[PDB]
Amino acid sequence: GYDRALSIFSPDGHIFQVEYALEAVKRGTCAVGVKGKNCVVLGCERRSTLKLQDTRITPSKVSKIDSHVVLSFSGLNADSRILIEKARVEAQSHRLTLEDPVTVEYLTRYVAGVQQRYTQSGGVRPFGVSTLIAGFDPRDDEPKLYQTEPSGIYSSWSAQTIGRNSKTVREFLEKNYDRKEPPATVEECVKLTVRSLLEVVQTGAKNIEITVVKPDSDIVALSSEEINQYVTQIEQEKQE
Template sequence: MSDKFYKYYLPDGRIFHVEVALKAINREGITSVALKGKTCAVVASQNIATNIANIDPETATSLFALNEIVGCVVTGRYSDCKYLVQEARREATDFHSYCRHQMAIDVLCHRMADILQLKTRCLEARALACSMMLISYDDDLGASVFKTDPSANYCGYFACASGAKQLQAEDFLRKNYKLNMSEKESVRLAVNCLENVLDFECQPQDIEVGIVTDCNRKFRKLNEKEIKEYNHYF
Protein backbone atom coordinates (compact mmCIF):
# COMPACT_ATOMS: atom_id res chain seq x y z
CA MET A 1 0.00 0.00 0.00
CA SER A 2 1.34 3.44 -0.88
CA ASP A 3 2.81 5.95 1.59
CA LYS A 4 0.17 8.43 0.42
CA PHE A 5 -2.54 6.14 1.78
CA TYR A 6 -0.88 5.90 5.19
CA LYS A 7 -0.58 9.67 5.27
CA TYR A 8 -4.34 9.98 5.64
CA TYR A 9 -5.48 6.63 7.05
CA LEU A 10 -4.54 4.35 9.93
CA PRO A 11 -4.68 0.54 9.68
CA ASP A 12 -7.63 0.46 12.13
CA GLY A 13 -9.75 2.53 9.72
CA ARG A 14 -9.41 5.96 11.34
CA ILE A 15 -9.15 8.90 8.96
CA PHE A 16 -6.82 11.71 9.96
CA HIS A 17 -8.58 14.64 8.30
CA VAL A 18 -11.97 13.58 9.70
CA GLU A 19 -10.55 13.54 13.21
CA VAL A 20 -9.00 16.95 12.60
CA ALA A 21 -12.37 18.28 11.40
CA LEU A 22 -14.15 16.95 14.49
CA LYS A 23 -11.58 18.62 16.74
CA ALA A 24 -11.90 21.87 14.77
CA ILE A 25 -15.62 21.95 15.55
CA ASN A 26 -14.87 21.92 19.27
CA ARG A 27 -12.16 24.56 18.98
CA GLU A 28 -14.74 27.13 17.82
CA GLY A 29 -16.03 27.21 21.42
CA ILE A 30 -19.74 27.01 20.51
CA THR A 31 -22.19 24.45 21.91
CA SER A 32 -25.58 23.58 20.41
CA VAL A 33 -28.38 21.23 21.42
CA ALA A 34 -31.45 19.78 19.71
CA LEU A 35 -34.37 17.79 21.09
CA LYS A 36 -37.94 16.85 20.33
CA GLY A 37 -41.08 16.92 22.44
CA LYS A 38 -44.54 15.55 21.88
CA THR A 39 -45.65 18.28 19.46
CA CYS A 40 -42.45 20.19 18.71
CA ALA A 41 -38.75 20.04 17.98
CA VAL A 42 -36.27 22.62 19.30
CA VAL A 43 -32.70 23.70 18.58
CA ALA A 44 -30.67 26.06 20.76
CA SER A 45 -27.16 27.43 20.43
CA GLN A 46 -24.85 30.07 21.80
CA ASN A 47 -25.11 33.29 19.86
CA ILE A 48 -21.91 33.42 17.80
CA ALA A 49 -22.24 37.21 17.48
CA THR A 50 -21.43 37.62 21.18
CA ASN A 51 -18.05 35.91 20.63
CA ILE A 52 -16.94 38.20 17.79
CA ALA A 53 -16.16 41.84 18.50
CA ASN A 54 -18.05 44.59 16.64
CA ILE A 55 -20.05 42.20 14.44
CA ASP A 56 -23.60 42.98 13.37
CA PRO A 57 -25.72 40.26 15.05
CA GLU A 58 -28.23 40.37 12.20
CA THR A 59 -25.59 39.01 9.80
CA ALA A 60 -24.30 36.09 11.91
CA THR A 61 -26.44 33.18 13.07
CA SER A 62 -26.19 29.43 13.58
CA LEU A 63 -29.88 28.79 12.82
CA PHE A 64 -31.16 28.38 9.26
CA ALA A 65 -34.32 27.31 7.47
CA LEU A 66 -33.48 24.78 4.75
CA ASN A 67 -36.95 24.48 3.19
CA GLU A 68 -40.56 25.03 4.24
CA ILE A 69 -40.55 22.29 6.90
CA VAL A 70 -36.90 21.69 7.88
CA GLY A 71 -34.62 23.92 9.92
CA CYS A 72 -31.17 23.37 11.35
CA VAL A 73 -28.46 24.53 13.70
CA VAL A 74 -24.87 24.31 12.49
CA THR A 75 -21.83 24.16 14.77
CA GLY A 76 -18.19 24.53 13.85
CA ARG A 77 -16.11 26.66 11.50
CA TYR A 78 -18.53 29.31 10.25
CA SER A 79 -17.35 29.31 6.63
CA ASP A 80 -17.84 25.55 6.42
CA CYS A 81 -21.22 25.85 8.10
CA LYS A 82 -22.45 28.40 5.56
CA TYR A 83 -21.26 26.21 2.70
CA LEU A 84 -23.08 23.15 4.05
CA VAL A 85 -26.26 25.17 4.57
CA GLN A 86 -26.13 26.39 0.96
CA GLU A 87 -25.66 22.82 -0.24
CA ALA A 88 -28.64 21.68 1.85
CA ARG A 89 -30.82 24.46 0.45
CA ARG A 90 -29.77 23.60 -3.09
CA GLU A 91 -30.62 19.93 -2.56
CA ALA A 92 -33.99 20.81 -1.03
CA THR A 93 -34.81 23.21 -3.87
CA ASP A 94 -33.84 20.72 -6.58
CA PHE A 95 -35.90 17.99 -4.91
CA HIS A 96 -38.94 20.28 -4.72
CA SER A 97 -38.54 21.26 -8.38
CA TYR A 98 -38.54 17.63 -9.54
CA CYS A 99 -40.96 16.04 -7.05
CA ARG A 100 -43.30 18.97 -6.33
CA HIS A 101 -43.25 18.40 -2.58
CA GLN A 102 -40.89 19.30 0.25
CA MET A 103 -37.86 17.13 0.95
CA ALA A 104 -38.34 15.16 4.19
CA ILE A 105 -35.87 15.63 7.01
CA ASP A 106 -34.48 12.08 6.94
CA VAL A 107 -33.89 12.23 3.18
CA LEU A 108 -32.22 15.64 3.44
CA CYS A 109 -29.98 14.56 6.30
CA HIS A 110 -29.01 11.42 4.39
CA ARG A 111 -28.05 13.58 1.40
CA MET A 112 -25.95 15.90 3.61
CA ALA A 113 -24.15 12.85 5.01
CA ASP A 114 -23.40 11.73 1.44
CA ILE A 115 -21.94 15.15 0.63
CA LEU A 116 -19.80 15.07 3.78
CA GLN A 117 -18.59 11.58 2.91
CA LEU A 118 -17.34 12.78 -0.45
CA LYS A 119 -14.96 15.04 1.47
CA THR A 120 -13.64 12.10 3.51
CA ARG A 121 -13.05 9.90 0.44
CA CYS A 122 -11.13 12.52 -1.52
CA LEU A 123 -7.54 12.72 -0.24
CA GLU A 124 -6.99 16.14 -1.79
CA ALA A 125 -10.07 17.70 -0.15
CA ARG A 126 -10.44 18.98 3.40
CA ALA A 127 -13.26 17.53 5.49
CA LEU A 128 -15.79 20.18 6.48
CA ALA A 129 -15.44 21.23 10.13
CA CYS A 130 -19.20 21.43 10.57
CA SER A 131 -21.86 19.51 12.44
CA MET A 132 -25.52 19.91 11.41
CA MET A 133 -28.57 19.10 13.52
CA LEU A 134 -31.89 19.26 11.68
CA ILE A 135 -35.43 19.49 13.08
CA SER A 136 -38.83 19.15 11.45
CA TYR A 137 -42.48 18.25 12.06
CA ASP A 138 -44.39 16.37 9.38
CA ASP A 139 -47.29 13.94 9.05
CA ASP A 140 -45.13 10.84 8.59
CA LEU A 141 -42.43 11.27 11.24
CA GLY A 142 -44.00 13.80 13.59
CA ALA A 143 -41.43 15.80 15.57
CA SER A 144 -37.98 14.76 14.34
CA VAL A 145 -34.34 15.48 15.12
CA PHE A 146 -31.50 14.27 12.88
CA LYS A 147 -27.77 14.90 13.08
CA THR A 148 -24.76 14.48 10.80
CA ASP A 149 -21.10 15.46 11.14
CA PRO A 150 -17.74 15.21 9.26
CA SER A 151 -17.65 11.43 9.81
CA ALA A 152 -20.68 11.27 7.45
CA ASN A 153 -22.69 9.31 10.00
CA TYR A 154 -26.34 10.32 10.38
CA CYS A 155 -29.06 9.22 12.79
CA GLY A 156 -32.36 10.29 14.27
CA TYR A 157 -32.30 11.36 17.94
CA PHE A 158 -34.62 12.18 20.80
CA ALA A 159 -32.01 14.70 22.00
CA CYS A 160 -28.43 15.42 20.95
CA ALA A 161 -25.68 18.01 21.20
CA SER A 162 -22.66 19.24 19.29
CA GLY A 163 -19.68 21.49 19.85
CA ALA A 164 -17.18 22.30 22.57
CA LYS A 165 -19.30 20.96 25.47
CA GLN A 166 -20.92 18.09 23.59
CA LEU A 167 -20.17 15.35 26.12
CA GLN A 168 -21.38 17.42 29.08
CA ALA A 169 -24.52 18.48 27.22
CA GLU A 170 -25.35 14.91 26.18
CA ASP A 171 -24.88 13.75 29.77
CA PHE A 172 -27.25 16.48 31.00
CA LEU A 173 -29.85 15.56 28.37
CA ARG A 174 -29.53 11.87 29.20
CA LYS A 175 -30.42 12.60 32.83
CA ASN A 176 -33.16 15.19 32.27
CA TYR A 177 -34.83 14.39 28.94
CA LYS A 178 -38.34 12.93 29.09
CA LEU A 179 -40.54 11.59 26.32
CA ASN A 180 -43.60 13.57 25.22
CA MET A 181 -42.53 16.88 26.76
CA SER A 182 -44.67 19.92 26.05
CA GLU A 183 -43.50 22.80 23.88
CA LYS A 184 -42.63 24.96 26.87
CA GLU A 185 -40.80 22.13 28.65
CA SER A 186 -38.77 21.39 25.53
CA VAL A 187 -37.55 24.98 25.17
CA ARG A 188 -36.78 25.19 28.87
CA LEU A 189 -34.73 21.99 28.78
CA ALA A 190 -32.71 23.18 25.77
CA VAL A 191 -31.92 26.51 27.45
CA ASN A 192 -31.21 24.91 30.82
CA CYS A 193 -28.84 22.46 29.14
CA LEU A 194 -26.79 25.32 27.70
CA GLU A 195 -26.77 27.13 31.05
CA ASN A 196 -25.60 23.99 32.83
CA VAL A 197 -22.70 23.17 30.53
CA LEU A 198 -21.58 26.80 30.11
CA ASP A 199 -21.70 27.47 33.88
CA PHE A 200 -23.43 30.83 33.65
CA GLU A 201 -27.00 32.10 33.46
CA CYS A 202 -27.76 32.72 29.80
CA GLN A 203 -29.58 35.89 28.86
CA PRO A 204 -31.90 35.94 25.82
CA GLN A 205 -29.32 37.86 23.79
CA ASP A 206 -26.69 35.19 24.53
CA ILE A 207 -28.53 32.32 22.86
CA GLU A 208 -30.51 31.47 19.75
CA VAL A 209 -33.55 29.21 19.79
CA GLY A 210 -35.39 27.75 16.80
CA ILE A 211 -38.60 25.72 16.86
CA VAL A 212 -41.13 23.84 14.75
CA THR A 213 -44.51 22.70 16.12
CA ASP A 214 -47.54 20.78 14.97
CA CYS A 215 -49.48 24.06 14.75
CA ASN A 216 -46.73 25.99 12.95
CA ARG A 217 -44.55 23.61 10.95
CA LYS A 218 -42.46 26.34 9.37
CA PHE A 219 -39.09 26.66 11.09
CA ARG A 220 -38.77 29.95 12.93
CA LYS A 221 -36.32 31.62 15.24
CA LEU A 222 -37.60 32.91 18.58
CA ASN A 223 -36.96 36.54 19.43
CA GLU A 224 -35.73 37.65 22.85
CA LYS A 225 -39.24 38.38 24.13
CA GLU A 226 -40.48 34.91 23.14
CA ILE A 227 -37.48 33.24 24.78
CA LYS A 228 -38.31 35.08 28.03
CA GLU A 229 -41.93 33.91 27.81
CA TYR A 230 -40.88 30.31 27.33
CA ASN A 231 -38.30 30.30 30.13
CA HIS A 232 -39.22 31.62 33.57
CA TYR A 233 -35.57 31.73 34.67
CA PHE A 234 -34.96 34.93 32.70
Protein backbone atom coordinates in the same frame (compact mmCIF):
# COMPACT_ATOMS: atom_id res chain seq x y z
CA GLY B 1 -6.04 19.63 -11.02
CA TYR B 2 -4.93 19.17 -7.41
CA ASP B 3 -5.45 15.44 -6.83
CA ARG B 4 -3.54 14.91 -3.56
CA ALA B 5 -4.96 12.32 -1.15
CA LEU B 6 -5.31 14.32 2.08
CA SER B 7 -7.71 11.97 3.89
CA ILE B 8 -5.90 8.62 4.26
CA PHE B 9 -5.63 5.69 6.69
CA SER B 10 -2.91 5.39 9.34
CA PRO B 11 -1.27 2.20 10.74
CA ASP B 12 -3.81 2.00 13.61
CA GLY B 13 -6.72 2.23 11.12
CA HIS B 14 -7.64 5.88 11.66
CA ILE B 15 -8.29 8.70 9.19
CA PHE B 16 -6.65 11.59 11.05
CA GLN B 17 -8.04 14.35 8.80
CA VAL B 18 -11.59 13.22 9.63
CA GLU B 19 -10.70 12.98 13.34
CA TYR B 20 -9.08 16.44 13.29
CA ALA B 21 -12.26 17.75 11.63
CA LEU B 22 -14.14 16.54 14.74
CA GLU B 23 -11.74 18.59 16.89
CA ALA B 24 -12.82 21.66 14.89
CA VAL B 25 -16.42 20.77 15.79
CA LYS B 26 -15.35 20.43 19.46
CA ARG B 27 -14.01 24.01 19.28
CA GLY B 28 -17.26 25.36 17.79
CA THR B 29 -20.02 26.99 19.83
CA CYS B 30 -22.52 24.63 21.48
CA ALA B 31 -25.69 23.61 19.65
CA VAL B 32 -28.54 21.52 21.08
CA GLY B 33 -31.63 19.78 19.68
CA VAL B 34 -34.65 18.55 21.65
CA LYS B 35 -37.86 17.07 20.19
CA GLY B 36 -41.17 17.14 22.09
CA LYS B 37 -44.45 15.34 21.39
CA ASN B 38 -45.60 17.81 18.70
CA CYS B 39 -42.52 20.03 18.19
CA VAL B 40 -38.74 20.24 17.89
CA VAL B 41 -36.55 22.98 19.39
CA LEU B 42 -33.03 23.97 18.31
CA GLY B 43 -30.89 25.79 20.88
CA CYS B 44 -27.61 27.51 20.00
CA GLU B 45 -24.79 29.22 21.91
CA ARG B 46 -23.48 32.69 21.02
CA ARG B 47 -20.08 33.37 22.61
CA SER B 48 -20.11 36.77 24.34
CA THR B 49 -16.46 37.55 23.53
CA LEU B 50 -17.83 39.40 20.47
CA LYS B 51 -19.68 42.55 21.58
CA LEU B 52 -20.27 45.67 19.48
CA GLN B 53 -21.87 43.20 17.04
CA ASP B 54 -24.80 44.03 14.78
CA THR B 55 -27.30 41.26 15.58
CA ARG B 56 -29.67 42.29 12.75
CA ILE B 57 -27.25 41.39 9.97
CA THR B 58 -24.88 38.85 11.58
CA PRO B 59 -25.46 35.35 10.12
CA SER B 60 -27.87 33.45 12.38
CA LYS B 61 -26.82 30.01 13.64
CA VAL B 62 -30.06 28.25 12.63
CA SER B 63 -30.64 28.16 8.85
CA LYS B 64 -33.84 27.26 7.00
CA ILE B 65 -33.20 24.63 4.31
CA ASP B 66 -36.85 24.65 3.24
CA SER B 67 -40.08 26.00 4.81
CA HIS B 68 -40.43 22.79 6.89
CA VAL B 69 -36.78 21.86 7.68
CA VAL B 70 -34.01 23.67 9.58
CA LEU B 71 -30.28 23.12 10.04
CA SER B 72 -28.02 24.23 12.89
CA PHE B 73 -24.34 23.35 13.31
CA SER B 74 -21.14 23.38 15.36
CA GLY B 75 -17.68 23.90 13.84
CA LEU B 76 -16.23 26.05 11.06
CA ASN B 77 -18.71 28.76 10.05
CA ALA B 78 -17.42 29.13 6.48
CA ASP B 79 -17.69 25.37 5.85
CA SER B 80 -21.31 25.32 7.08
CA ARG B 81 -22.43 27.75 4.35
CA ILE B 82 -21.32 25.31 1.63
CA LEU B 83 -23.36 22.44 3.13
CA ILE B 84 -26.39 24.69 3.67
CA GLU B 85 -26.28 25.97 0.07
CA LYS B 86 -26.03 22.44 -1.38
CA ALA B 87 -28.86 21.32 0.91
CA ARG B 88 -31.08 24.24 -0.14
CA VAL B 89 -30.44 23.46 -3.83
CA GLU B 90 -31.23 19.76 -3.32
CA ALA B 91 -34.44 20.68 -1.46
CA GLN B 92 -35.74 22.66 -4.46
CA SER B 93 -34.48 20.00 -6.89
CA HIS B 94 -36.45 17.33 -4.98
CA ARG B 95 -39.64 19.41 -5.14
CA LEU B 96 -39.09 19.89 -8.88
CA THR B 97 -38.67 16.20 -9.80
CA LEU B 98 -40.63 14.29 -7.12
CA GLU B 99 -43.37 16.98 -6.75
CA ASP B 100 -43.06 16.68 -2.97
CA PRO B 101 -40.81 18.37 -0.39
CA VAL B 102 -37.90 16.39 1.09
CA THR B 103 -38.33 14.25 4.18
CA VAL B 104 -36.03 15.21 7.06
CA GLU B 105 -34.32 11.80 6.74
CA TYR B 106 -33.69 12.34 3.01
CA LEU B 107 -32.23 15.83 3.48
CA THR B 108 -30.01 14.47 6.27
CA ARG B 109 -28.91 11.55 4.07
CA TYR B 110 -27.93 13.99 1.29
CA VAL B 111 -25.94 16.33 3.57
CA ALA B 112 -24.26 13.32 5.20
CA GLY B 113 -23.40 11.94 1.74
CA VAL B 114 -21.72 15.21 0.77
CA GLN B 115 -19.65 15.14 3.99
CA GLN B 116 -18.64 11.51 3.30
CA ARG B 117 -17.63 12.30 -0.30
CA TYR B 118 -15.13 14.86 1.06
CA THR B 119 -13.45 12.11 3.16
CA GLN B 120 -12.39 10.04 0.11
CA SER B 121 -11.99 12.58 -2.69
CA GLY B 122 -8.60 13.80 -3.94
CA GLY B 123 -7.44 17.36 -3.28
CA VAL B 124 -10.09 18.19 -0.66
CA ARG B 125 -10.24 18.18 3.15
CA PRO B 126 -13.27 17.05 5.17
CA PHE B 127 -15.88 19.52 6.41
CA GLY B 128 -15.06 20.69 9.95
CA VAL B 129 -18.78 20.70 10.74
CA SER B 130 -21.39 18.58 12.52
CA THR B 131 -25.04 19.44 11.89
CA LEU B 132 -28.38 19.06 13.63
CA ILE B 133 -31.19 18.73 11.09
CA ALA B 134 -34.75 19.03 12.39
CA GLY B 135 -38.29 19.41 11.04
CA PHE B 136 -41.48 17.61 10.02
CA ASP B 137 -42.09 15.46 6.93
CA PRO B 138 -44.83 16.65 4.53
CA ARG B 139 -48.35 15.84 5.82
CA ASP B 140 -46.85 14.28 8.97
CA ASP B 141 -47.08 15.32 12.65
CA GLU B 142 -44.22 13.12 13.96
CA PRO B 143 -41.19 15.24 14.99
CA LYS B 144 -37.81 14.51 13.38
CA LEU B 145 -34.28 15.23 14.66
CA TYR B 146 -31.09 13.99 12.98
CA GLN B 147 -27.35 14.52 13.48
CA THR B 148 -24.46 14.39 10.98
CA GLU B 149 -20.67 14.54 11.36
CA PRO B 150 -17.50 14.96 9.18
CA SER B 151 -17.07 11.20 8.63
CA GLY B 152 -20.50 11.09 6.97
CA ILE B 153 -22.37 8.90 9.48
CA TYR B 154 -25.84 10.09 10.48
CA SER B 155 -28.55 8.98 12.90
CA SER B 156 -31.83 10.00 14.56
CA TRP B 157 -31.95 11.39 18.10
CA SER B 158 -34.65 11.93 20.74
CA ALA B 159 -32.36 14.71 21.94
CA GLN B 160 -28.77 15.62 21.12
CA THR B 161 -26.06 18.25 21.53
CA ILE B 162 -22.86 19.08 19.63
CA GLY B 163 -19.96 21.53 19.94
CA ARG B 164 -17.88 22.76 22.89
CA ASN B 165 -18.84 21.40 26.32
CA SER B 166 -21.36 19.11 24.58
CA LYS B 167 -20.30 16.31 26.95
CA THR B 168 -21.81 18.27 29.87
CA VAL B 169 -25.15 19.13 28.20
CA ARG B 170 -25.47 15.55 26.88
CA GLU B 171 -25.04 14.40 30.50
CA PHE B 172 -27.88 16.75 31.51
CA LEU B 173 -30.22 15.57 28.74
CA GLU B 174 -29.55 11.86 29.43
CA LYS B 175 -30.96 12.14 32.99
CA ASN B 176 -33.66 14.78 32.36
CA TYR B 177 -35.16 13.55 29.05
CA ASP B 178 -37.71 10.72 29.38
CA ARG B 179 -38.64 8.74 26.24
CA LYS B 180 -41.93 7.32 27.60
CA GLU B 181 -43.15 10.90 28.16
CA PRO B 182 -41.34 13.67 26.23
CA PRO B 183 -42.06 17.43 26.52
CA ALA B 184 -45.80 17.52 25.77
CA THR B 185 -46.04 21.25 24.96
CA VAL B 186 -43.91 23.91 23.26
CA GLU B 187 -43.21 25.58 26.64
CA GLU B 188 -41.93 22.37 28.27
CA CYS B 189 -39.65 21.63 25.30
CA VAL B 190 -38.17 25.15 25.09
CA LYS B 191 -37.70 25.20 28.89
CA LEU B 192 -35.73 21.93 28.79
CA THR B 193 -33.62 23.25 25.90
CA VAL B 194 -32.81 26.52 27.71
CA ARG B 195 -32.09 24.60 30.94
CA SER B 196 -29.61 22.36 29.11
CA LEU B 197 -27.75 25.37 27.64
CA LEU B 198 -27.65 27.11 31.05
CA GLU B 199 -25.35 24.29 32.24
CA VAL B 200 -22.71 25.63 29.81
CA VAL B 201 -23.54 29.09 28.40
CA GLN B 202 -22.36 31.45 31.24
CA THR B 203 -24.88 34.34 31.05
CA GLY B 204 -28.49 33.94 29.86
CA ALA B 205 -28.63 37.34 28.15
CA LYS B 206 -27.88 37.44 24.39
CA ASN B 207 -25.83 34.21 24.53
CA ILE B 208 -28.79 31.85 23.97
CA GLU B 209 -30.66 31.57 20.66
CA ILE B 210 -33.84 29.47 20.45
CA THR B 211 -35.75 28.38 17.34
CA VAL B 212 -39.04 26.45 17.55
CA VAL B 213 -40.23 24.34 14.61
CA LYS B 214 -43.79 22.97 14.50
CA PRO B 215 -45.70 20.86 11.93
CA ASP B 216 -46.93 22.22 8.58
CA SER B 217 -44.02 24.64 7.97
CA ASP B 218 -44.57 26.57 11.22
CA ILE B 219 -41.11 27.88 12.16
CA VAL B 220 -40.40 30.86 14.44
CA ALA B 221 -37.32 32.32 16.17
CA LEU B 222 -37.71 33.54 19.77
CA SER B 223 -36.61 37.09 20.68
CA SER B 224 -34.26 38.18 23.48
CA GLU B 225 -37.09 39.13 25.87
CA GLU B 226 -39.03 35.89 25.30
CA ILE B 227 -35.91 33.80 26.05
CA ASN B 228 -35.04 36.01 29.04
CA GLN B 229 -38.41 35.09 30.61
CA TYR B 230 -37.44 31.39 30.50
CA VAL B 231 -34.05 32.22 32.05
CA THR B 232 -35.78 34.14 34.87
CA GLN B 233 -38.28 31.36 35.63
CA ILE B 234 -35.64 28.59 35.67
CA GLU B 235 -33.34 30.33 38.18
CA GLN B 236 -36.21 31.42 40.47
CA GLU B 237 -37.33 27.78 40.76
CA LYS B 238 -33.69 26.76 41.32
CA GLN B 239 -33.44 29.00 44.42
CA GLU B 240 -34.96 26.35 46.72
